[PDB]
Amino acid sequence: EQLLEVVMEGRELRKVAREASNVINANTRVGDVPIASDEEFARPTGQGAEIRDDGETYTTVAWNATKLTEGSRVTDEMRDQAMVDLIERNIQRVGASLENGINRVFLTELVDNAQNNHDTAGSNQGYQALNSAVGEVDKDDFRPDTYVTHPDYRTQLFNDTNLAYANRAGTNEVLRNREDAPIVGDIAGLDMHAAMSSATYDDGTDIGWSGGSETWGFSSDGDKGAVVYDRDNIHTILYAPNGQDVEIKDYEDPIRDITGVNGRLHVDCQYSQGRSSATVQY
């Protein structure tokens, strides 16, 4: 006789920020991105008149990367008697909790600080909403290339007959493979789809976090369910003292027969140009 030496996994959240934004590996926890002023129009003037100067001017987007941390501690008796490697399992949980943290920092900047909005007002929430939101960014003379999406928005979108009927979509891929269909990442001039999890956005209900301004969702009047944006104009800034990325320490308490694992990373997320982004609203 031997036990079922297995553990069933819990829910695992979608991790995309590191692909769905410009990642800066910063040399310092605090820093600046220089921004140039917008284009203008040359002045009409008379012959012999002085050329009036109206040169480039500059400003910065500052970053202040905040340390996200997660950890655990177990007695050595528990390590020795565990059904599976508790240190390996806690290392995985710590790594996952930091990556989830990055995705929360990213999505909360992305959703709160987009400078344009398409209010669907119920109604035409499928392809027409994505096209409309591209139109909102296009009116500010940027162009988007990516969209970030809530599960309820995805569900609405894949019910749209324009995508669900193979003749209207040009392929049956959405009907067959749903979000894994290549057209879902090649729609309305956008060349990337970044599927998010529902829990990712900062509601301020989770401990240690103070909420964003919006509601992430797509089921009730006023929810923001997708963001259409320029991937080059949203920055995720990662800082680490001892390398480039997430650092996990495995340690023993010096005196108490306790072992633990602790993870850290510093992260900030900032728009370069918030005008390059539009939310879609229910």
Partner 1 sequence: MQLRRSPGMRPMDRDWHQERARAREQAYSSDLTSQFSESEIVKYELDTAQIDGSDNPRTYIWNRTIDLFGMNGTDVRELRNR
Partner 2 sequence: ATETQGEHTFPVEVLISGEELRGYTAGEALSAGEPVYLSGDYEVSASSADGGEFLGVNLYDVASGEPVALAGDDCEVRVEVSEQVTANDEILPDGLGTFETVATSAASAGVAIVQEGAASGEVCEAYIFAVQGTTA
Partner 3 sequence: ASSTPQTNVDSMGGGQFNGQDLTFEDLRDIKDVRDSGGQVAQLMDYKALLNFGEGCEIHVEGDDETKQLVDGEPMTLSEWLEDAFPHLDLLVLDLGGDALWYPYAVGEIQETITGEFKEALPAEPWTLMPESDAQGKVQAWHQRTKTHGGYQTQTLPADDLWHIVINKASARDEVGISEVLRNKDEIQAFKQNEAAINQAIELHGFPQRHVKVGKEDGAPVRDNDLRRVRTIFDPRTTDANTAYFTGQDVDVETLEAHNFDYSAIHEMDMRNLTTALGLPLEAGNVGADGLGSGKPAELRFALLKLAIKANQRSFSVQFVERVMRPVVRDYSPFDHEADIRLEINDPLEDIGEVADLIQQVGDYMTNEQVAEKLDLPAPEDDEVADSYRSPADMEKDEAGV
Binding-site annotation: residue ranges for Mg(2+): 1, 32, 40-41, 50, 54, 70, 116, 119, 140, 177, 186, 191, 221
**Radius of gyration of the chain from its Cα atoms, rounded to whole angstroms:** 24
- Say which amino acid occupies 169: A
- Extract the tokens encoding 197: 């999890």
Q: Is 54 in the site for Mg ion (CB under 5 A)?
A: yes
Residue closer to partner 1 (CB basis): 96 or 258: 258
Summarize the annotated binding site as residue ranges: 1, 32, 40-41, 50, 54, 70, 116, 119, 140, 177, 186, 191, 221
The interface with partner 3 within residues 226-255 (CB under 8 A) comprises: 241-246, 248, 250
Consecutive H or E run containing 162: helix 161-164
The interface with partner 2 within residues 50-69 (CB under 8 A) comprises: 64, 66-67
CA dihedral 113, 119, 125, 127 (to 10 degrees): -70
- Extract the tokens encoding 7: 């553990």
With beta carbons less than 8 A apart as the criterion, state whether 67 and 264 touch.
Answer: yes
* Other CB atoms within 10 A of residue 17 CB: 28
The interface with partner 2 within residues 233-252 (CB under 8 A) comprises: none
Pairwise CA distance, residues 261 & 282, whole Å: 42
Q: Is 116 in the site for Mg ion (CB under 5 A)?
A: yes
Q: Is 49 in the site for partner 1 (CB under 8 A)?
A: no
92 binds, among partner 2, Mg ion, partner 3, none (CB under 5 to 8 A by kind): partner 3
Q: Is 9 in the site for partner 1 (CB under 8 A)?
A: no
SS3 94: helix
Which of 120, 176, 126 shows the shortest CA–CA distance to 154? 126
Among 61, 74, 188, 248, binds partner 1 (CB under 8 A): 74
Q: Is 46 in the site for partner 3 (CB under 8 A)?
A: no
Stretch that binds partner 1, among 26-34, 62-70, 72-80, 233-241 (CB under 8 A): 72-80
Backbone dihedral region for residue 76 (phi beyond 0: left; psi -120 to 50: alpha; all else: beta) = alpha
Residues ≥6 apart with Cβ < 8 Å to 266: 29, 65, 66, 67, 68, 238, 239, 240
Q: Is 183 in the site for partner 1 (CB under 8 A)?
A: no
Pairwise CA distance, residues 131 & 160, whole Å: 13
* Other CB atoms within 10 A of residue 4 CB: 7
Stretch that binds partner 2, among 152-160, 179-187, 188-196, 203-211 (CB under 8 A): 203-211
Total residues contacting partner 2 by CB under 8 A comes to 9
Burial 177-189 (b: 16+ CB within 10 A, else e): eeeebeebbebbe
The interface with partner 3 within residues 64-123 (CB under 8 A) comprises: 91-92, 95-96, 99
Stretch that binds Mg ion, among 41-49, 56-64, 78-86, 221-229 (CB under 5 A): 56-64
CB of 3 to partner 1, least distance (A): 5
CB of 88 to partner 1, least distance (A): 12
- Binding residues (CB under 8 A) for partner 3: these are 18, 91-92, 95-96, 99, 241-246, 248, 250
